[PDB]
Amino acid sequence: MRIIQTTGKRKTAIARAVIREGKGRVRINGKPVEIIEPEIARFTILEPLILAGEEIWNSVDIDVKVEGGGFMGQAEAARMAIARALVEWTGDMSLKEKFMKYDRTMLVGDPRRTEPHKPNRSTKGPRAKRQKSYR
Amino acid sequence: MQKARIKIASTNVRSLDEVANQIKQIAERTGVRMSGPIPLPTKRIRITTRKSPDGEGSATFDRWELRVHKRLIDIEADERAMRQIMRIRVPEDVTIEIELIS
Amino acid sequence: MAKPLNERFFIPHEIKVMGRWSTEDVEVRDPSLKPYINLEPRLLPHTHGRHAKKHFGKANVHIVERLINKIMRSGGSHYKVAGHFMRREHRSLNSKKVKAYEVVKEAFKIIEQRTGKNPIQVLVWAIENAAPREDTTSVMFGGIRYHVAVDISPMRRLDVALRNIALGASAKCYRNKMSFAEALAEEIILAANKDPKSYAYSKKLEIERIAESSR
Amino acid sequence: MATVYDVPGDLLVERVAQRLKEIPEIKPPEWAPFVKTGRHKERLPEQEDWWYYRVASILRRVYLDGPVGIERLRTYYGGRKNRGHAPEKFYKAGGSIIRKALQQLEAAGFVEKVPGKGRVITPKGRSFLDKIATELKKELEEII
Amino acid sequence: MAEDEGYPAEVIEIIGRTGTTGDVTQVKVRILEGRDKGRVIRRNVRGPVRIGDILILRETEREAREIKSRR
Amino acid sequence: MANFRHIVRVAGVDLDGNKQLRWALTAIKGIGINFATMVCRVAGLDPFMKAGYLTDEQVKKIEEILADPVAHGIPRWAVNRPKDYETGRDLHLITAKLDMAIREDIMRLRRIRAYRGIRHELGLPVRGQRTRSNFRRGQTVGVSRKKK
Amino acid sequence: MGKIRQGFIKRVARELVNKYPNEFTTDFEHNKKKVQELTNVTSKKIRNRIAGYVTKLVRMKMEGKIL
RNA sequence: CAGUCCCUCCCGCUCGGGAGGAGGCACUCUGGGGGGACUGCCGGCGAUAAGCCGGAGGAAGGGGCGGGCGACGGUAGGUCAGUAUGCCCCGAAACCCCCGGGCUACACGCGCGCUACAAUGGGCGGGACAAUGGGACCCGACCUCGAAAGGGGAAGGGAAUCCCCUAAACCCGCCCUCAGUUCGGAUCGCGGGCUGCAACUCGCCCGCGUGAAGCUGGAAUCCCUAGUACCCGCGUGUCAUCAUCGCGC
């Protein structure tokens, strides 16, 4: 068989993702994909899988562990890592370019992430000044 | 023999690296079997401060940083063997803690 | 509910929006709106898109993501959590696009229940109509004050359209049985008709009308 | 061919709750839903479902973790109590429902206290859950 | 609705900005519609617009303009 | 069902609604939202069903339960006032007891010449702190207890 | 908002091609290596700029007007 | 349960799903060091220069991005009530010790914030998720008693190795069905816990009862430009305790 070990990371949700041949396993953090209460963010993961097509999907076992604090953010990290896992697998330009055309959140992370909370002038929020009325 | 843990932690980046590298290099050839120097953290201490004693105006506020960075060594040797390696100069301000167990 | 929802998982995959609405069902007949809209692309509006990056990176925003965001807008200092908790998440998200998304989805469900058509075909239709063609900007140039004829660009048209639709929903949405998912949903239909009941379409006419005078 | 892992909680919980009624070794004691409630409640619901769901999730928790506290099960719940215009702060459930719930299971033989100082599943507790999960997981596939 | 008649015109060139607001930008247009065809007009357009875009002109007979300029 | 009426009388001749049973008791002074459900358990009725879907029979139960909550059950912190004026073990409060019991303890305090007793009379929060520029713009707290 | 290359960055590159023209190239990387050997590396980021401007200065030299 | 000859548990449609321990440092990560981005290439505008736009490749671009970084000086700006310090003044006092009170008084007026006027909703229940940090008369596993607040007993930890710790927003199913209410939580009665010699003045929290104004706000006016704003909770300092604060995630 084969072990290929890939990562995706979106907004510091970090996906440790393995693809091996098998039977159609979808595992996230130990549990089936099914557990997730949200429908919506499940439909984000499913998008690289359908675009390659279900044939490959059935033929391989993808286990991921997506260790990110967002529920959207997990969906996000898992979608980038699946897209990359799929492209390493078959190895063709066909699947890579197809992905680039559809969206670039499937195979690029972000160039930034966060900004600190600036010191401020005794007021909350990193880009904020104390209200005035002194005129 | 006794397995001895040298834990070495320091405030600056410069000093801790010289010690770890030299400990491993002195230790390498002799009765010693040594496990490679391992970095443990900077627990990075923030101390977040107000500048101005006034409290008044805009304030521009201080982000501080004290970094203390930890490297952890196992060595297998006698107690006599440990002192020999310990001989080194060491950067002022380098804490060296020793654990001795069989 | 849960099984239907699972089926709602089977169907979007195949490829539909929100689990059961084919994107192919609709086309933009008018060529103006065609690059201006995102009817042709994909499935979930949650996209984190980072649009507004470049010049016109806001045009590769899924129509529905623009709607969720525009829709989100209203929100002041105050805190929300599962607890005793808020409002703070508004009539219109004194909050989360995450939650914001649900309304759009329920609104999508409701509009489908009545009209029975693909609700993107209704919302897309409504955005085309809601946008006023002409506007007057008090434009003085050179110091001389004119109350002039100005032609609306298409990006500006969509933006006016969606903002106006959202704006109207909140107004009725005020302490009244419409549920913004309902209020929006009822608005999206009528905005689509150019009906006399659409606070959005009233300004669409009136802005053009006053503009026509002023030009 | 299933585990509590496999099964969306929403379906699982009603199923494990009904099994709790059936078997029928675990039961509501009267004092607990009366007024010896978790934190504050707008209304306090007169349901068998209440008590059973509470215990249903302790069986799931005890499986997943190793040592799981009373303190741990109390905090885990989520829920908040008013402090006025000063914003709400987190606070934690009742100790009451939990200690007795852990105990009613203990007699059932489903939980046991390890010598380690903690709590862990028996074979009997673990068994009851996977059988139910297999039933649920088998049902899930049949339905569109 | 009724059409009116929509006169489609595309923008040949973006001359510069007008309004003290700034809010119109003035752009030169060429027409592509059944009636006239080809007519060049300098219309006042608002909002983000690029070169080669399409504008529906409500009134063909227009062309207000004011002009200058870059050194 | 259990025999519609849109108005039933409960807790004396005070009226009982068609809002919901739990909520119609909350209106009746001295029986609040939470206390209502406790009595409901004892009486044996559905808590979530509409008020006024009660025969005459149901009505009798709730009244004896009101009179000495403590005989039937009802914990000694869950009951309305427990340890009453230093020599009552527990009591109940309703509309006539509740009025009286707070008005007596206030009356006592004027006479003793407490700070507490005078602070209410003036119209002021005792242990709320500020009175400095709260109740702004001619507004009032209204102190105790009702202006509806 | 704006971009303009400092003046210090310009001075080093100009002197460098004048001393050793024929030991400089149209490859960024080749000039960067040479620049590193020539003058002190206060930092990495300035090393790259000097090298870059050198690449341009050679292209310009071809033309026959190099300012 | 990366990859696994092994091993103990459960489950099974025997195909197959999951956890422990061997074992294995792959991976995530830690911190130390190195590359990469410079208009280098390509086209347009421009004096063929300087620069500006645009394009390809690429993880990223044309101050990439976010802080620290702020001249000579002025407002006789702000602090002699943090310290330093010229001068003047006080000397049973403008000193010194002590208890108690006062800073927390209110008919009002304003600034700065928090919570808020409900169905984009509550209750109930389940289930998936983080990070900065802080932790020795300190954080406190877990166990037990108590409704709880908290108490009794006790493991580990001076720290990638334990603890606070639960993320909250999220979603699903169920009950509820738009009122000044099941909104909102002021006010007041009573029971009780906690620190401290002591919380009436003047602490917070639990539980029952009470249950106010407010149902979207004139004139006028403030902030901010993107992973920000809007929105949600989490920690920290100080520190027993008053946080609807300040700093930070």
Swiss-Prot record, chain A:
GO terms for biological process: maturation of SSU-rRNA from tricistronic rRNA transcript (SSU-rRNA, 5.8S rRNA, LSU-rRNA); translation. PROSITE patterns: RIBOSOMAL_S9. One of its GO terms (cellular component) is cytosolic small ribosomal subunit. One of its GO terms (molecular function) is structural constituent of ribosome. Residues 119-135 have a biased composition (Basic residues). InterPro entries: Ribosomal_Su5_D2-typ_SF, Ribosomal_uS9, Ribosomal_uS9_archaeal, Ribosomal_uS9_CS, Ribsml_uS5_D2-typ_fold_subgr. Part of the 30S ribosomal subunit. HAMAP family: Ribosomal_uS9_A. Belongs to the universal ribosomal protein uS9 family. This is Small ribosomal subunit protein uS9. It comes from Pyrococcus furiosus (strain ATCC 43587 / DSM 3638 / JCM 8422 / Vc1).
Swiss-Prot record, chain B:
Residues 33-59 are annotated as: Disordered. Transmembrane segments: none annotated. One of its GO terms (cellular component) is small ribosomal subunit. One of its GO terms (molecular function) is tRNA binding. One of its GO terms (biological process) is translation. Keywords: Ribonucleoprotein, Ribosomal protein. Involved in the binding of tRNA to the ribosomes. Part of the 30S ribosomal subunit. HAMAP family: Ribosomal_uS10 (MF_00508). This is Small ribosomal subunit protein uS10. It comes from Pyrococcus furiosus (strain ATCC 43587 / DSM 3638 / JCM 8422 / Vc1).
Swiss-Prot record, chain C:
Coiled coil: none annotated. GO terms for cellular component: small ribosomal subunit. GO terms for biological process: translation. It holds the Pfam family Ribosomal_S7. Keywords: Ribonucleoprotein, Ribosomal protein, RNA-binding, rRNA-binding. One of its GO terms (molecular function) is structural constituent of ribosome. InterPro entries: Ribosomal_uS7, Ribosomal_uS7_arc, Ribosomal_uS7_dom, Ribosomal_uS7_dom_sf, Ribosomal_uS7_euk/arc. Belongs to the universal ribosomal protein uS7 family. Part of the 30S ribosomal subunit. HAMAP family: Ribosomal_uS7_A. One of the primary rRNA binding proteins, it binds directly to 16S rRNA where it nucleates assembly of the head domain of the 30S subunit. Is located at the subunit interface close to the decoding center. This is Small ribosomal subunit protein uS7.
From Swiss-Prot, chain G:
InterPro entries: Ribosomal_eS17 (IPR001210), Ribosomal_eS17_CS (IPR018273), Ribosomal_eS17_sf (IPR036401). Pfam families: Ribosomal_S17e. One of its GO terms (molecular function) is structural constituent of ribosome. One of its GO terms (cellular component) is ribonucleoprotein complex. Keywords: Ribonucleoprotein, Ribosomal protein. Gene3D superfamilies: Ribosomal protein S17e-like. Coiled coil: none annotated. The keyword Ion transport does not apply. One of its GO terms (biological process) is translation. Belongs to the eukaryotic ribosomal protein eS17 family. Part of the 30S ribosomal subunit. NCBIfam families: PRK01151.1. This is Small ribosomal subunit protein eS17. It comes from Pyrococcus furiosus (strain ATCC 43587 / DSM 3638 / JCM 8422 / Vc1).
